[PDB]
Swiss-Prot record, chains A, B:
PANTHER family: CELL DIVISION PROTEIN ZAPD. Belongs to the ZapD family. Mostly homodimer in solution. Interacts with the C-terminal tail of FtsZ. This is Cell division protein ZapD. One of its GO terms (biological process) is division septum assembly. Coiled coil: none annotated. It holds the Pfam family ZapD. GO terms for molecular function: identical protein binding; protein homodimerization activity.
Length: 246, 246
């Protein structure tokens, strides 16, 4: 049968962390950059990556979250009587993940400074503005050799290993913190108390012409399952879904 | 010779048609819409494309150009041995694209009225807002069956078939009405009058480490040839390039 995951942030920093995790993956979509399309896709996701670091301070809270997962993993270390080896190198994976970020360059500086990127990013604010005759540097850049762009791209993506990785760990260690408890929604409606929880990972069943519309006040969240167009396939119903509170 | 074709729009109206022709090309380029990237690339294009239409009325500008080129071809028909039926037959395509257009659903509406798009479009201005948790409605659309979207993609394309049929011809007739003269540039500089010309097609050479920086004063235009890399690789000398006033 058909299945779909629905991640949703329960707080203001997971929102940011997921936004970025999405932005960083997009850099790597295919990566034979060849066409106008190719380059723009990249720089928009980079510029958008940059726009976040205009605010936020993504370095400090990742650090603090890594110490959290350590203090978590700490809890499990002594007893129970299963897994010691894996978890220790898993902690040492965080210690090195944590360590490397703070001493690394002011995150995003390389691409912020970059000349080719500098140009395209100011022209990403006009509709159809970033084009051939508008970005004469871009237009030639594409005409250069096939593996010249690939030498500038890798360095472009590689500059954010301090951020990419640190995050990549933290988020794996979140997504495993909560098992999938099988719920049921009355009247196409549901509430609970998230608690400390950062994320919801809502698994949706038979594709009911429905999707999770989540709201929340303080710690408590309210899921309401909306259908695709109001009077198109209206079946609010009693749903039998699966939801984990990471 | 690894010739680097630089097209430059000398008037405000050509500047517009290039923006349009380029944005449409960026729809049909990728095509299957498998990924999230593949989505956002398509939806963002449309977004921007819709923002251009709300300016200047391209319907009532393009038609004036479809009316122009018709009369231009009509000059050649008088004589001599060169062409007769083949141009007469072409004129029927320009009458066709011209009327097909003059009687078409107000350009944009099918993509503004369609709900999924205008939703996505009001969120684009936010960096990384086009995210599963801020627009879950796109997640499902991207989880829908492999066949579903294609029919929905091909509609949104055909919505814009009247314009694409009209434009592509007007630009391709314009990129034919003139040939490539060979010209020279001292101290990386050039000046010349455009006159009746809508465009500058300009073939530089095998990446001479140079892009042209065209400016304008009325119908007069000037090229300041700039090199790659700032205070490093300045190589303007006397340069030998070729141009086309189209």
């Amino acid at each position: 049968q058909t299945q779909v995951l629905f991640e949703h942030p329960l707080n203001e920093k997971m929102r940011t962390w997921l936004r970025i995790e999405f932005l960083i993956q997009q850099l790597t979509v295919n990566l034979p950059i060849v066409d106008h399309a190719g380059a723009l896709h990249f720089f928009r996701n980079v510029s958008e990556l940059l726009d976040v670091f205009e605010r936020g301070e993504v370095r400090t809270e990742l650090l603090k979250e890594l110490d959290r997962q350590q203090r978590k993993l700490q809890t499990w270390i002594g007893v129970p009587g299963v897994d010691q080896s894996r978890i220790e190198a898993l902690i040492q994976q965080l210690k090195a993940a944590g360590s490397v970020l703070i001493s690394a360059p002011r995150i995003g500086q390389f691409l912020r400074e970059d000349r080719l990127i500098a140009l395209v990013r100011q022209r990403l604010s006009i509709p159809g503005g970033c084009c051939s005759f508008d970005l004469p540097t871009l237009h030639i850049w594409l005409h250069l050799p096939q593996a010249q762009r690939d030498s500038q791209v890798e360095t472009w993506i590689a500059s954010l290993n301090p951020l990419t990785q640190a995050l990549t760990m933290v988020l794996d260690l979140i997504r495993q913190s909560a098992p999938f408890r099988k719920q049921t929604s009355l009247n196409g409606f549901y509430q609970d108390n998230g608690g400390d929880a950062d994320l919801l990972r809502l698994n949706l069943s038979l594709d009911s012409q429905l999707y999770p519309q989540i709201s929340g006040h303080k710690s408590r969240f309210a899921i309401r399952f909306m259908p695709l167009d109001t009077e198109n396939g209206q079946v609010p119903e009693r749903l039998d879904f699966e939801l984990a509170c990471c």
